[PDB]
Amino acid sequence: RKFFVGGNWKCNGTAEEVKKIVTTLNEAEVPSEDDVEVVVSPPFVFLTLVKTLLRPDFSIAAQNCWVRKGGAFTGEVSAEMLINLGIPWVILGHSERRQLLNESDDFVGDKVAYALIQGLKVIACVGETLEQRESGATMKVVAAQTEAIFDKVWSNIVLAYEPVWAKVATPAQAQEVHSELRKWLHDNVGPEVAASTRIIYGGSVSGANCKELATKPDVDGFLVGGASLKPEFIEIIKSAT
């Protein structure tokens, strides 16, 4: 499995700040496209700006898209719009959309299937809350979330586990969930999907905590949050080696 590092800018950025991030990414030296796959994800309104300024060996993701074809959906952005604009990736089911915008398991599932059929590659996010983990329902929740995406879809998916519950989150806890998610793919979709699908870790990843996580056998990379806005995003990319 090729190491995968995605940077989720979330709802952040001005034109000025975007320019400095992109110039910093453009001047960094990282492993080759055969050793790490790098995706950066700006807000909708900056996607074309980053696309025309960023080095082409990094790819761009949108942070969301609509559940079906375009039309009378004020405020929404369709997969075909992103494809028309040369954006190859999309993040779907991020915990903040599941929690704050009330995206259901099946809604996310329908979104993933529709982006995939149109030709987007998808970082599909799953993750359990603090209360869900305290109750012992980590795997049941994460399995139900992944199942809703599988019920509807495999080559062009990266799975991202978000420890929404985190609190200290250990590499061993990451490996437990990643290995349990891969076994779920093995048992429900097929061993080839399990062996080939990248499962990346999305828990407060920083230059300072990434190395021990990246050595875990079933962690295939990272979905980076706040550090994706910072120069240390480059150190996280270099943990691929």
- Position 11 contacts a copy of itself (CB under 8 A): yes
The CA distances from residue 148 to 68, 107, 163, in Å, are: 16, 9, 19
Which one is catalytic: 94, 103, 128, 178? 94
**Active-site entry in 37, 103, 128, 162:** 162
Q: Is 112 in the site for a copy of itself (CB under 8 A)?
A: no
Residue type for 42, please?
P
Taking the C-alpha atoms of residue 106 and residue 86, their distance in angstroms, rounded to an integer, is 27
Residue with tokens 């590499």: 171
Segment lying near a copy of itself (by CB under 8 A), choices 98-106, 132-140, 176-184, 231-239: 98-106
Find the Cα–Cα–Cα–Cα dihedral 122, 58, 176, 147, rounded to 10°.
0
CA atoms within 13 A on the CB side of 29: 0
Beta carbon nearer to a copy of itself, 3 or 66: 66
* 22: amino acid identity, one letter: V
| Residue 186 bears catalytic tag | no
Q: Does 7 interact with Cl ion (rule: CB under 5 A)? A: no
Annotated catalytic residue 178: no
What positions carry a catalytic annotation?
A: 94, 162
Site for a copy of itself, rule CB under 8 A: 8, 10-15, 43-45, 47-49, 62-64, 66, 70-78, 81-82, 84-85, 91, 94, 96-97, 100-102, 225-226
